[PDB]
Amino acid sequence: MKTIIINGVQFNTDEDTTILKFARDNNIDISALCFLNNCNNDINKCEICTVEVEGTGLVTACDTLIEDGMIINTNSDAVNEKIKSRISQLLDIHEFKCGPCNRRENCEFLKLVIKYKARASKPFLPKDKTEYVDERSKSLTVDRTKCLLCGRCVNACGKNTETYAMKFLNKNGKTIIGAEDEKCFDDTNCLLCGQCIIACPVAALSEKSHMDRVKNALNAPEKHVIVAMAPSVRASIGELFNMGFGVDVTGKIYTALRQLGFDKIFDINFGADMTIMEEATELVQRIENNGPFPMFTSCCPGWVRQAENYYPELLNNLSSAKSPQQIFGTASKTYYPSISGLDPKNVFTVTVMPCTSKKFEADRPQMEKDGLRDIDAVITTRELAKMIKDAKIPFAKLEDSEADPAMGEYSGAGAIFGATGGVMEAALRSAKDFAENAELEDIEYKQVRGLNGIKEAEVEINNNKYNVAVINGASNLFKFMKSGMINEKQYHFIEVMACHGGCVNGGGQPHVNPKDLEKVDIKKVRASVLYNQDEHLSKRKSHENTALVKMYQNYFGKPGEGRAHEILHFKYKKSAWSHPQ
Numbered sequence: 190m191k192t193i194i195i196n197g198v199q200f201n202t203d204e205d206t207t208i209l210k211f212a213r214d215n216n217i218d219i220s221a222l223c224f225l226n227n228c229n230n231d232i233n234k235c236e237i238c239t240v241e242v243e244g245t246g247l248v249t250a251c252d253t254l255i256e257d258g259m260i261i262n263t264n265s266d267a268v269n270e271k272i273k274s275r276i277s278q279l280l281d282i283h284e285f286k287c288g289p290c291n292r293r294e295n296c297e298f299l300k301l302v303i304k305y306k307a308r309a310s311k312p313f314l315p316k317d318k319t320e321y322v323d324e325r326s327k328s329l330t331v332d333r334t335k336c337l338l339c340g341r342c343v344n345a346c347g348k349n350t351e352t353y354a355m356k357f358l359n360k361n362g363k364t365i366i367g368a369e370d371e372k373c374f375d376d377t378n379c380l381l382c383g384q385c386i387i388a389c390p391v392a393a394l395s396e397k398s399h400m401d402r403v404k405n406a407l408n409a410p411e412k413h414v415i416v417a418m419a420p421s422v423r424a425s426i427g428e429l430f431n432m433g434f435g436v437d438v439t440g441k442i443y444t445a446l447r448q449l450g451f452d453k454i455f456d457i458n459f460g461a462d463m464t465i466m467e468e469a470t471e472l473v474q475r476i477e478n479n480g481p482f483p484m485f486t487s488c489c490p491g492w493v494r495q496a497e498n499y500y501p502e503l504l505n506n507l508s509s510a511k512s513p514q515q516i517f518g519t520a521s522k523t524y525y526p527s528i529s530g531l532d533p534k535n536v537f538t539v540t541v542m543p544c545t546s547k548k549f550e551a552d553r554p555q556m557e558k559d560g561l562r563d564i565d566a567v568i569t570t571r572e573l574a575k576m577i578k579d580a581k582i583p584f585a586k587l588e589d590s591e592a593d594p595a596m597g598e599y600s601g602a603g604a605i606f607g608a609t610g611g612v613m614e615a616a617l618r619s620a621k622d623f624a625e626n627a628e629l630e631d632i633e634y635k636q637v638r639g640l641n642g643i644k645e646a647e648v649e650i651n652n653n654k655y656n657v658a659v660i661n662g663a664s665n666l667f668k669f670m671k672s673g674m675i676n677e678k679q680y681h682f683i684e685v686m687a688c689h690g691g692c693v694n695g696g697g698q699p700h701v702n703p704k705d706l707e708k709v710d711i712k713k714v715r716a717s718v719l720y721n722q723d724e725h726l727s728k729r730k731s732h733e734n735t736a737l738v739k740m741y742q743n744y745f746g747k748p749g750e751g752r753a754h755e756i757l758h759f760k761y762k763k764s765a766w767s768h769p770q
C-alpha cells in the first residue's frame with residue numbers, strides 16, 4: 190500500500206499502476222503522444238508525458254509505476270519547458286502546413302503544439318517531398334514529412350494483426366517507418382487493413398485516395414454513377430460532423446449523396462443480403478455433401494490477404510460467394526442495366542467503405558467481367574466526409590431521404606454485417622430456414638456477438654449440431670490457428686474479420702483521439718446502431734428482402750447454381766508448387 194503526493198494532493202492507494210493512468214483516473218491532466226494501446230515507443234520515447242518525481246528528476250509518466258513516497262509535480266516550469274522542447278524538436282522534422290492537411294480538424298499533434306505554444310527551432314520546409322511520399326499501394330499512402338516516429342503504427346500493427354508488416358527501417362542511415370525492405374506494402378505480408386492509419390496521431394499514414402476517380406466520373410457526361418455505402422458508414426460518419434458517437438445518420442447520407450451529384454443511391458447492405466443468399470445456400474450444399482468443412486467467410490479482404498499470405502491451404506475452404514461489395518458491383522453491371530436500359534459500359538460503381546483493404550479487393554485483376562469492373566472506385570468513410578465538407582453540404586441539418594429501392598432495400602440481417610459476428614448471425618438466419626424448409630421465429634444469435642476475440646457456438650440445423658466460430662481480429666486468427674484450436678473440434682462455418690470489433694473498427698473509419706477512446710467504447714457504440722436497425726426492421730432475414738427476391742426471380746435464377754454461381758462467385762487459389770520460392 191502506498192502514499193503518493195501529486196501537485197500537493199495526498200493519495201493513499203494499493204494499486205500498481207503507472208503515473209499516467211493514476212492521474213487520468215483522478216482527473217489530473219498529463220499529456221501523452223506516443224502512448225497508445227498500452228504501449229509507448231520504447232526505442233524513441235516522445236517524453237510528452239514528462240512529470241517530475243522529486244529526488245529523481247523528470248520521468249515519463251506513461252511507463253513509470255507509482256511507488257510509495259513519490260512526490261510528483263505535473264505542471265512545474267521545468268516539466269512544461271521539457272515538453273515544449275520535445276514538441277519543438279518534433280516541429281523541426283514536421284512540415285507544419287495545416288491548411289491543406291487531411292488531419293487539420295482532428296490532429297493530435299496540432300493540439301499539443303497549441304497547448305504548449307511550441308515552435309520549431311528551424312522550420313522544416315522540404316523542397317522535394319517526392320522522396321518522403323509512398324503512394325505505390327492500392328490501399329495505403331505514407332507522407333513522411335508528417336511522421337513523428339512515435340511508433341504507434343508499428344505497435345498497432347503487431348497488436349491488431351501480429352504480422353509486424355509495419356516496421357522501423359534504416360533508410361540511408363536515418364529511421365523511417367514502412368513495409369519490409371521498404372517495399373510497396375501490397376507486395377509484403379501486410380493485410381492492408383489500415384489499423385496503422387487508425388493509430389497515427391497525424392497525417393503521415395492515410396488511405397490511397399480514390400476521390401479523383403469519383404469526381405471525374407461524376408463530371409463525365411455519359412457516366413451514370415451509382416453510390417452504395419457499407420453497413421458501418423451510417424453508424425460512424427456523423428462523428429466527423431461533431432454529432433457525437435453512436436448516431437444513426439443513414440437518411441442524411443442518402444441526401445448528401447444526392448447533393449454530391451450521384452446518379453443512383455443504392456446500399457451495400459443490399460449486397461450483404463446477396464452474399465447471404467449465396468453463402469447460406471453454399472453452407473447448406475456443404476452440409477448435404479458432408480463437406481468440405483470448415484467453410485470460412487470470404488467477405489473481409491484483410492482476412493483474404495491473411496489467408497493468401499499465411500494459410501494458403503485454407504483458400505479452397507473459403508466460401509465462393511463474392512463479398513457484398515464485389516457481389517453488388519457485379520450485379521450493378523448486369524442486373525441493373527437490365528432494369529434501367531443503361532449501357533453497362535456507362536455504369537460507374539462507387540462504394541463507401543470503413544475499410545482501406547476494400548480498395549485492393551476492388552482492384553483485383555479478375556474482379557470484372559466482359560471488360561467491366563465490378564467496382565470502379567472505393568472511398569473511405571473519411572473520404573466521403575471530406576467530399577461532403579468540400580461541397581459545403583450542411584450534413585448535420587440535412588433532411589432524411591431514402592435509397593433507391595431496386596438495389597437499396599436491406600433486411601436486418603444485412604444491417605448487422607459491420608459488427609463482429611454479424612455475418613455469422615445473418616448467415617445462420619437464412620441457412621437454418623433453407624435447410625429446414627421453415628420460417629423460424631427465433632433468429633437472434635447473441636452468443637456470437639460482442640468483443641471477445643474468439644467466439645465459438647454450437648448450432649442446431651435440421652436436427653443436427655454444427656460448430657461455428659467467430660474470429661474477431663487478425664491477431665485472433667493467428668491465435669486460433671497457431672494454438673491448434675482449429676483441431677480441438679470439427680468446425681463447420683467460421684467467420685473471420687481482420688479488424689477487432691468488425692468493420693465498425695475498420696481502417697477507413699473516423700479517427701478517435703485517445704481520451705475519447707477511454708471514455709467511449711467505440712466498437713460497441715458504433716455496432717449498437719446496426720443492431721438497433723435490425724431489431725426494428727420488418728424483414729430480418731436476407732432471403733425476405735423483397736427487392737432481392739425480385740432480382741433473383743427475374744434475373745439470376747436460383748442462388749448457388751447456374752448463372753448465379755457463374756457470375757456472383759469468386760474462388761482464390763493457392764500458388765502451384767514451384768522451386769525456388
Ligand code: SF4
Nearest residue numbers: 286287290296391392
Ligand atoms: S499533421 Fe497535424 S500538425 Fe502536421 S500539418 Fe497536418 S494538421 Fe498540421
Ligand code: SF4
Nearest residue numbers: 346379380382383385
Ligand atoms: S495495413 Fe494492417 S497489416 Fe499492413 S502495416 Fe498497417 S496494420 Fe499492419
Ligand code: SF4
Nearest residue numbers: 336337339340342389
Ligand atoms: S506514421 Fe504516424 S503512427 Fe507511424 S511513427 Fe509516423 S507519426 Fe507515428
Ligand code: SF4
Nearest residue numbers: 489491544688692695
Ligand atoms: S474487418 Fe472490415 S474494415 Fe477490417 S479489413 Fe475486414 S472488411 Fe476491412
Ligand code: FES
Nearest residue numbers: 223224235236251
Ligand atoms: S507518451 Fe510517454 S513516452 Fe511518449
Ligand SMILES: [Mg+2]
Nearest residue numbers: 228229231252
Ligand atoms: Mg514501453
Ligand SMILES: [Mg+2]
Nearest residue numbers: 406407408409
Ligand atoms: Mg454526372
Ligand SMILES: [Mg+2]
Nearest residue numbers: 509510754758
Ligand atoms: Mg462455389
